Scaffold this motif. Structure first.
Motif, PDB file in Angstrom:
ATOM      1  N   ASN A 138      77.528 -30.817   4.236  1.00  0.00           N
ATOM      2  CA  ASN A 138      78.795 -31.533   4.276  1.00  0.00           C
ATOM      3  C   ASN A 138      79.925 -30.662   3.745  1.00  0.00           C
ATOM      4  O   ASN A 138      81.023 -30.638   4.313  1.00  0.00           O
ATOM      5  N   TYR A 139      79.672 -29.935   2.656  1.00  0.00           N
ATOM      6  CA  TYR A 139      80.700 -29.070   2.087  1.00  0.00           C
ATOM      7  C   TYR A 139      81.030 -27.914   3.022  1.00  0.00           C
ATOM      8  O   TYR A 139      82.206 -27.614   3.260  1.00  0.00           O
ATOM      9  N   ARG A 171      84.803 -27.020   4.868  1.00  0.00           N
ATOM     10  CA  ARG A 171      85.627 -25.819   4.859  1.00  0.00           C
ATOM     11  C   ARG A 171      85.424 -24.953   6.094  1.00  0.00           C
ATOM     12  O   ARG A 171      85.987 -23.855   6.160  1.00  0.00           O
ATOM     13  N   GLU A 227      85.458 -33.530  -7.250  1.00  0.00           N
ATOM     14  CA  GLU A 227      84.810 -33.423  -5.947  1.00  0.00           C
ATOM     15  C   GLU A 227      85.797 -32.937  -4.897  1.00  0.00           C
ATOM     16  O   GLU A 227      85.469 -32.075  -4.074  1.00  0.00           O
ATOM     17  N   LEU A 281      84.993 -28.936  -3.768  1.00  0.00           N
ATOM     18  CA  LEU A 281      84.305 -28.974  -2.478  1.00  0.00           C
ATOM     19  C   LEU A 281      84.745 -30.217  -1.709  1.00  0.00           C
ATOM     20  O   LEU A 281      84.110 -31.271  -1.770  1.00  0.00           O
ATOM     21  N   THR A 282      85.842 -30.081  -0.970  1.00  0.00           N
ATOM     22  CA  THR A 282      86.283 -31.121  -0.055  1.00  0.00           C
ATOM     23  C   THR A 282      86.734 -30.579   1.291  1.00  0.00           C
ATOM     24  O   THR A 282      86.857 -31.363   2.237  1.00  0.00           O
TER      25      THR A 282
END
Ligand code: 2JL
Ligand code: 2JL
Ligand code: NAG
Ligand code: NAG
Lengths: 412, 384, 408, 132, 82
Positions: free
Chosen positions: B280-281, B285, B336, B340-341
């Motif tokens: 997901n992270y 990005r 969060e 890591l978004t």
């Protein structure tokens, strides 16, 4: 479920034909808190009871499930006697000593973790928003919408204005009768094939031509405006979670509800930024989660802040509801037991062990993830929206009915 | 935060999601830290009956704590005590954005089926009355029922066919007033059909990793492709519960994770399977925004991270409480999103221009084909 | 600390009688006195400074005037409570002024205040010359030129089997304009096929026109109007169209500035002198008025917090005579430097912005962020009628020429 | 709006309808494969070509639905062109701070400011804005 | 949007005795309408479309019209002869 005859749970089968294992819960029936009740055997089954059964198959211990008395999850509140805070619901039943293990959906937090041990979570979920899923309805009236109601009656006169001009421009220049100009001027506009009298002169041709170009633009602008109105105008009241400005400020988006004495209430208490939002719903929080979902279908409550593990189940079964927003408070459940519990080391290990066995995936496959309708908004034109046009052509039949009798009488 | 490093103890600077979490725990419970970064191994792996990595140093009592991206399991939990997880973790699936989607039978969304039948029946009555009521009772080949239908039907469907116009003042008016309905019928149909192909959006669905795409991959569909990073937690987890799956996955090993994304970026690999915590992270990005974290919220082994502590440590009780305090005060989503978004986490509308084809519109020709055969049943019966 | 109760800035509420003590997240402000707590925006600024600077306080609501005033000899209100040694600070909705600056010293402003203008939301026009828009003059003009070549070709291509050029123009123009007019068709297959090729272009041309015409009045937003205070349309309305009606709340800071600058503004604006801010909005919302003029920091908040979002201001950097708010002091209080340093810290950081997303905000967005497609009316398409009106006049010109050819 | 294979298939359905109309009219108890093409091509392109009236019951119904299919093609083509044209605003306005191209360095959307000054002091103040 | 609201200034050293009168004088120019004349003279002046189809994006269809002309010359000869 209420117990069947002979005081035993009814026999039922799952989707795969396996028996859904049941336990004899001994708790209140038709609770209605604030009124006297009595203890009665009841039939329980589902996710958090199968995981309980597999738990008893590992540590080799027996059990007798009894439902909670008051009906609230639990929240440490100060009694009327000064500020001697005392728990309630499950937590009261566990700390006092009547209960020993709480195997039920129970979000863990500091206020609860200080007095009891909690073990590892058996499912990860957050909090979302459940609202009524509006059916896509086209807000289109009759054909009077694309153009102003003060424009058709001037276009209609322009049709006659060209007709009288065309006939006057052909009966004088070096042909077509007056009626032909009436049909030709109309026949271009409505695109009908009627009208056989074309302009003859080189001066009547251009007037009857630029009118034709004007006829296309009027129709083309009608199509463009209807497309612009239909595409643009859609019902957009969707809420993108707690970050939506409507939720972020006190507004009358009907009502935002929760369950009293739950983790959601305490989550709304320690955040002083939204302290008055919680005080707003302090007069609106229900006494149970099941009732509030019924309110959403009744359009008395178009919001709900409850555990996402529960709402998504209802958003799949009761497909007239939909979930919105992003999980803004993620915290797993827990099989909580009292402090200094010999089962604590075993219980947490079995929960972690069940995750990789695939068993913990199996349970949610049968119960929560058997899947249903999702769909989840281009409205379709219906008879209600287009009834105006059919009325006109229906009235055209009766308009001609009173016109044929006067057309034949013209000869006499 | 200062950090050490063996080979000589070279000082170094530490910062990250675990570090700031450790900073919050440090002041909350008033304990101090002297982080020394591990050298032998990584994370930890019980090899030859001995523990290495971060776990290995704690069980030898050389650490007393092991912060980081430590995944909670049961092999570690019987050796090193664990804290409450501060981030979830699963076994997710990665699929492409599909570059849009197509809607079959995209020619019948407007005009709910009540509209067609209502117009169709009144189309017959207008033709009926025109040649019966306003023709037989009016002055002035004649106008039969077939010709009337052949004309009024033509007017609705963008009149271009040759027609036999009626004769008479009232018959012309009836046809003329019907032509106005055709204009509104056609104008609104095109306008409404434009709406249905503007908000087409995108369709993505995997139904988890326990569906036929990953339980019967060699189905009627072409062979599905999915790979992971071997010698890791996901391979160990999936090899036990899913015996058959492990054999199938061996044909698409991807070693380095960045190499696997190249296959996804080129279409060589149908799907990517790995830990959901970074998947997901990493897709958050990811550049190009062609990867979506499908299967989100429904993963295989939901076991969170943690802060490993020495066995039966008194600090274990005070660490779990501190971590949960940061949860209640709404702090995780702050860090969060801080760390890591990504940037490709906006709305998933992704409306794209349509490329209508035979796949996009199919039943439109089927109606022509069905009517082509429908003429035959009226073609043989003409002999009888 | 002296303070005044204002709707978006300082809210005073009764202390919770159930618990006896007042609710948390509030300050125990007495009066000049039953125990009582208050909250709001300026309160949060004060409590944040207390943690940073390290000072205690004892708030008390002023009961003399509003934000201070001069009574020709004595200073009353919130400002007077500081000018007379009674209060050390006067945090609140205090507008920095030149006259107030020489009796008390202020801090660095944390909220900007000016002189703005309201107006009702504009529905939005449809570019009344829209019919010629979804194309280019290169495409428009040359397509007429193209048909002239095709018509000339068609007559020549049909001659080698009474068509003539006149019927070819009439036939070819018919297809390109949603063919409904009487037409004469050729007989030769070479001319018949060519017409079909032009007919195919007619379908594409018509399809492209209506497709882009929809896009023109979809991605168009809705602002349609911007006005300024210094504009003559606002300055004097007696030499222009039916006068624009605008007024304010007299006996205030906004009236002082509007009096010193334009004396005629003061004389004219007394015709519409609404004594209540909320009442003026209703008159503005009922079409009685056309613009309400007041402080930006107190009128932007009421524009943001409004159902329907029907009120939009034009104070997007056009505020005139802009002086910010601030914390009054004692002109020698030696708190100015610590207060200014801490206040600039929040402004330097993004601290004050969060408090702006708080009470000084609303669900309605002053930015357009919204498109509306309404009925085409007559004005929004009167241009297409003018093209026809040219044809009627142009046809008459040909009529005279058709008449005078015989005589000459 | 239509993929290159759709045109070929729609370019032969007109001919497939044309031969079918001629075949069905020739065995009716003067299309002659010449007026059938004009009828087939005329309906699709909305051109009043030819007087071909398929008097046969079998042929007329095919022509009756031939026009219906022709309407769909033109109506869908306009809508697809309309849908494509309205979805042609890829400008991707920055909308100030907190933009996808601004939160992280895209290596393709280069953006800079004046050295020293206040923005550098502003940006360096917060650790959150240390990523870009 | 303006994400950092902080006006300009007129900086001077701490010990400068001009601070009191400079602040009073700069505040008087705001109310006097003077600072509404400079921006009128220096700033506010000089205050100088869904992608129309244009000839581009349509050269193909007009080439088809031209293409029919060319093909016609190669088609008239065959039709006359046959
Ligand atoms: O669970 C695992 O498999 C281990 C470990 C454990 O306790 O074993 N738990 C956590 C997962 N992990 C790994 O080695 C691993 C493997 C790859 C990436 C990252 C972290 C960030 C990345 C960013 C980009 C690409 C790859 C990565 C961690
Ligand atoms: O500048 C002014 O005119 C004074 C003062 C001064 O320094 O004099 N400076 C600040 C403005 N103000 C006022 O009287 C005033 C006038 C109207 C409202 C509010 C405060 C809150 C509201 C909420 C809703 C409606 C109206 C209001 C203050
Ligand atoms: C927990 O499990 C261990 C290992 O199986 C066992 O030795 C221990 O007795 C268990 N705890 C209890 C309370 O039985
Ligand atoms: C500031 O202005 C006052 C008012 O006239 C004056 O008395 C004083 O001398 C001035 N200060 C300086 C430093 O010029």
């Amino acid at each position: 479920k209420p117990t069947l005859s002979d005081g035993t749970c009814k026999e039922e089968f799952t989707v795969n034909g396996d028996p859904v294992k049941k336990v004899i819960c001994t708790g209140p029936n038709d609770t209605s808190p604030g009124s006297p009740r009595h203890t009665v055997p009841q039939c329980c089954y589902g996710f958090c009871i199968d995981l309980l059964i597999k738990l008893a198959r590992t540590m080799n211990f027996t059990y007798e499930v009894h439902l909670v008395a008051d009906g609230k999850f639990g929240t440490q509140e100060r009694v009327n006697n000064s500020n001697k805070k005392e728990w309630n619901g499950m937590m009261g039943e566990l700390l006092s000593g009547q209960a020993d293990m709480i195997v039920a959906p129970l979000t863990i937090n500091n206020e609860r973790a200080q007095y009891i041990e909690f073990s590892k979570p058996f499912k990860y979920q957050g909090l979302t928003i459940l609202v009524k899923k509006e059916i896509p309805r086209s807000t289109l009236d009759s054909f009077m919408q694309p153009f102003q109601s003060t424009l058709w009656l001037l276009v209609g006169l322009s049709v006659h204005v060209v007709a009288v001009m065309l006939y006057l421009l052909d009966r004088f220049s070096p042909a077509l009768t007056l009626s032909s100009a009436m049909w030709f001027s109309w026949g271009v506009l409505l695109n009908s094939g009627i009208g056989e009298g074309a302009p003859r002169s080189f001066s009547a041709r251009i007037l009857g031509m630029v009118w034709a170009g004007f006829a296309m633009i009027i129709v083309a602008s009608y199509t463009a405006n209807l497309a612009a109105f239909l595409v643009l105008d859609r019902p957009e009241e969707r809420i993108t979670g707690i970050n939506d400005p409507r939720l972020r400020n006190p507004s009358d988006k009907f009502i935002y509800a929760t369950v009293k004495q739950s983790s959601v209430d305490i989550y709304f208490r320690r955040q002083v930024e939204l302290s008055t939002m919680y005080r707003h719903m302090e007069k609106h929080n229900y006494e149970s989660a099941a009732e509030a979902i019924q309110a959403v279908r009744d359009n008395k409550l178009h919001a709900f802040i409850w555990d996402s593990a529960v709402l998504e189940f209802e958003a799949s079964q009761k497909c007239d509801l939909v979930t919105t927003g992003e999980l803004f408070f993620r915290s797993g459940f827990g099989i909580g037991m009292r402090k200094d519990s010999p089962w604590k080391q075993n219980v947490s290990l079995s929960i972690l062990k069940s995750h990789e066995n695939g068993f913990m995936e199996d349970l949610d496959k049968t119960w929560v993830r058997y899947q249903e309708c999702d769909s989840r908004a281009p409205a379709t034109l219906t008879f209600e929206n287009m009834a105006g046009v059919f009325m006109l052509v229906a009235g055209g039949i009766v308009a001609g009915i009173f016109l044929i009798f006067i057309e034949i009488a013209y000869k006499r | 935060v200062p950090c050490q490093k063996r080979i000589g103890y070279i000082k170094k600077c530490c910062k990250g999601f675990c570090i700031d979490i450790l900073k919050k725990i440090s002041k909350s419970v008033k304990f101090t830290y002297d982080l020394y970064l591990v050298t032998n191994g990584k994370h930890g792996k019980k090899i030859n009956g001995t523990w290495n990595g971060m776990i290995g140093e704690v069980v030898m009592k050389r650490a007393y704590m092991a912060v980081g991206s430590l995944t909670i399991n049961e092999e570690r939990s019987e050796v090193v005590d664990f804290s409450v997880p501060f981030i979830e973790t699963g076994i997710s699936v990665m699929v492409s954005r599909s570059n849009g989607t197509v809607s079959p039978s995209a020619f019948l969304e407007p005009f709910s089926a009540d509209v067609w039948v209502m117009m169709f029946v009144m189309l017959l009555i207008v033709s009926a009355v025109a040649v019966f009521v306003f023709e037989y009772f009016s002055p002035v080949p004649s106008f039969t029922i077939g010709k009337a239908i052949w004309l009024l039907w033509g007017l609705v469907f963008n009149n271009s066919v040759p027609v036999q116009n009626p004769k008479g003042t009232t018959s012309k008016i009836m046809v003329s007033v019907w032509a106005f309905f055709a204009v509104i019928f056609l104008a609104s149909y095109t306008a409404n059909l434009a709406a249905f192909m503007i908000q087409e959006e995108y369709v993505d669905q995997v139904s988890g990793l326990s569906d036929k795409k990953f339980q019967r991959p060699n189905d009627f569909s072409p062979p599905f492709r999915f790979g992971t990073v071997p010698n890791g937690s996901t391979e160990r987890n999936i090899r036990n519960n899913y015996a058959e799956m492990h054999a199938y996955m061996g044909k698409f090993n991807q070693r380095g994770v960045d190499d696997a994304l190249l296959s996804l970026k080129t279409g060589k690999l149908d799907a990517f399977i790995y830990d959901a915590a970074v998947l997901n992270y990493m897709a958050g990005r990811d550049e190009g925004c062609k990867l979506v974290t499908i299967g989100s919220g429904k993963v295989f082994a939901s076991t969170g991270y943690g802060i490993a502590i020495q066995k039966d440590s008194g600090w274990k009780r005070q660490v779990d409480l501190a971590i949960l305090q940061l949860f209640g005060d709404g702090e995780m989503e702050e860090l969060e999103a801080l760390w890591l978004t990504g940037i490709c986490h906006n709305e998933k509308n992704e409306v794209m221009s349509s490329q209508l084809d035979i796949d996009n519109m199919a039943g439109v020709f089927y109606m022509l084909g069905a009517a082509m055969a429908l003429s035959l049943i009226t073609f043989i019966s003409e002999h009888l | 600390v002296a303070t005044l109760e204002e709707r978006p800035f300082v809210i005073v509420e009764p202390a919770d009688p159930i618990s006896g003590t007042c609710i948390r997240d509030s300050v125990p402000c007495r009066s000049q006195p039953e125990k009582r707590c208050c909250k709001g925006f300026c309160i949060d600024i004060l409590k944040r400074l207390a943690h940073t600077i390290g000072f205690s306080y004892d708030l008390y609501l002023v009961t003399n005037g509003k934000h201070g005033k001069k009574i020709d000899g004595v200073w009353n209100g919130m400002i007077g409570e500081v000018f007379y040694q009674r209060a050390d600070m006067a945090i609140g909705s205090l507008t920095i002024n030149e006259e107030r600056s020489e009796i008390v010293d202020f801090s660095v402003p944390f909220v900007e205040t000016g002189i703005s203008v309201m107006v009702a939301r504009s529905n939005g026009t449809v570019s009344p010359s829209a019919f010629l828009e979804p194309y280019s003059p290169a495409v428009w003009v040359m397509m007429f030129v193209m048909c002239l070549t095709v018509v000339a070709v068609t007559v020549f291509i049909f001659e080698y089997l009474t068509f003539t050029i006149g019927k070819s123009i009439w036939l070819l123009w018919a297809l390109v304009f949603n063919n409904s007019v009487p037409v004469e068709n050729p007989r030769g297959t070479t001319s018949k096929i060519m017409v079909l090729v032009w007919a195919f272009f007619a379908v594409i041309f018509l399809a492209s026109y209506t497709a882009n015409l929809a896009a023109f009045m979809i991605q168009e937003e809705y602002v349609d109007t911007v006005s300024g205070l210094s504009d003559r349309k606002f300055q004097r309305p007696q030499e222009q169209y039916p006068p624009l009606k605008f007024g304010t709340v007299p006996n205030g800071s906004t009236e002082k500035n509007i009096r010193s600058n334009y004396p005629d503004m003061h004389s004219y604006m007394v015709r519409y002198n609404q004594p209540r801010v909320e009442e003026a909005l209703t008159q503005l919302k009922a079409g009685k008025l056309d613009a309400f003029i007041y402080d930006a920091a107190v009128l932007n908040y009421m524009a943001r917090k409004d159902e329907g979002c029907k009120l939009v201001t034009i104070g997007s950097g056009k505020v005139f005579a802009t002086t910010g708010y601030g914390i009054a002091l004692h002109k020698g209080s030696r708190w100015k430097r610590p207060i200014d340093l801490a206040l600039l810290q929040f402004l330097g950081d993004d601290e004050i912005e969060m408090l702006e997303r708080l009470w000084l905000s609303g669900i309605c967005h002053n930015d357009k962020i919204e498109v509306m497609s309404s009925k085409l009316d007559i004005d929004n398409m009167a241009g297409v009628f003018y093209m026809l009106l040219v044809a009627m006049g142009l046809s008459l010109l040909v009529f005279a020429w058709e008449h005078l050819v015989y005589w000459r």
